[PDB]
From a paper:
[name]_is a 15.8 kDa singleton from an anaerobic, hyperthermophile [name], with an unknown function. Therefore, based on primary sequence analysis, [name] is a non-Pfam singleton with an unknown function. Each monomer is made up of 8 α-helices arranged in a spiral pattern around a vertical axis that runs through the centre of the protein. The structure reveals an all α-helical topology similar to those observed for nucleic acid processing proteins.
[name] crystallized as a dimer in 3 different crystal forms. Superimposition of the dimers crystallized in different space groups revealed no obvious differences in the position of the Cα atoms suggesting an identical mode of dimerization in all the 3 crystal forms. To find out if there is a difference in the packing arrangement of the dimers in the 3 crystal forms and to quantify it, a computer program was compiled and a calculation was performed to analyze the inter-dimer distances of 2 neighbouring dimers for all 3 space groups. As expected, the inter-dimer distance between 2 closest dimers in space groups C2221 and P4122 is relatively similar when compared to that of the distance between dimers of space groups P212121 and C2221 or P212121 and P4122, where there is almost no recognizable co-relationship. This result further supports the inferences of crystal packing analysis where we saw that the dimers rotate less than 3° along the C axes during the transformation from P4122 to C2221 resulting in only a minor change in crystal packing. A mathematical calculation performed on the dimers of [name] crystallized in different space groups corroborated the findings of the crystal packing analysis of molecules packed in different space groups.
Author numbering:
A (entry chain B), B (entry chain A): 2 to 129
Write the structure that this text describes.
């Protein structure tokens, strides 16, 4: 329950950031998904401090990242893909390729879809 | 020199990437600066696979990032700032603030420098 207190409570809340920046992968794992939720919108002031943390602990983040990519929250997967994919070390990069391919193949029916299809296409082109 | 064999030999050389991704901070330290040199130009194909490694070992990378920001290689410091600064965890972010401040204050005499001055400005505004 002490760990869960380290989770930001609102979009401006960096009170726990120093404590967070100190944990090892297995110390932060239990709340990694909770931290990833603060990337649903990167324009939230706290997203800029959460992002480095989750990238640094990317290896234990992966199953949760895939869940997001397999979800229906377009904005959330857009930020996750855009911000995290270029900073995934090789083995983790290969884990998410599947989702990028899938997303790049979607029919473009609105602008939100077009954004994530074109990002997926550019990222497959560049990174893989 | 077993370790140095993991430094890519040329701008397409990803032959050592799998091994690099298995090291921890203190193993990789002795070549972190050699790895940082591969960000002198992020269009080099190997750069995209080195960036995840250097960010992941950012804590032993900081004195060497400072050295790069204190050098006179424009493009190198453009990429290092642009690519690494958003992904520094709080305490490493703090260490580099000084160099950003200094760079945003440079008189723009050689116009090639503008991108560094203005990037530092933008990043001071956004991340701090």
């Amino acid at each position: 329950t002490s760990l869960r207190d380290l989770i930001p409570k609102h979009k401006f809340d960096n009170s726990t950031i120093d404590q967070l920046c100190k944990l090892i992968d297995n110390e932060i794992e239990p709340i990694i998904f909770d931290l990833l939720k603060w990337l649903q919108d990167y324009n939230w002031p706290i997203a800029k401090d959460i992002l480095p943390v989750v990238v640094l602990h990317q290896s234990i983040a992966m199953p949760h990242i895939l869940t997001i990519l397999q979800g229906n929250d377009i904005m959330w997967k857009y930020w996750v893909i855009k911000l995290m994919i270029p900073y995934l070390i090789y083995p983790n990069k290969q884990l998410v390729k599947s989702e990028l391919e899938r997303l790049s193949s979607l029919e473009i029916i609105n602008e939100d879809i077009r954004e994530i299809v074109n990002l997926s296409k550019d990222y497959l082109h560049f990174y893989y």
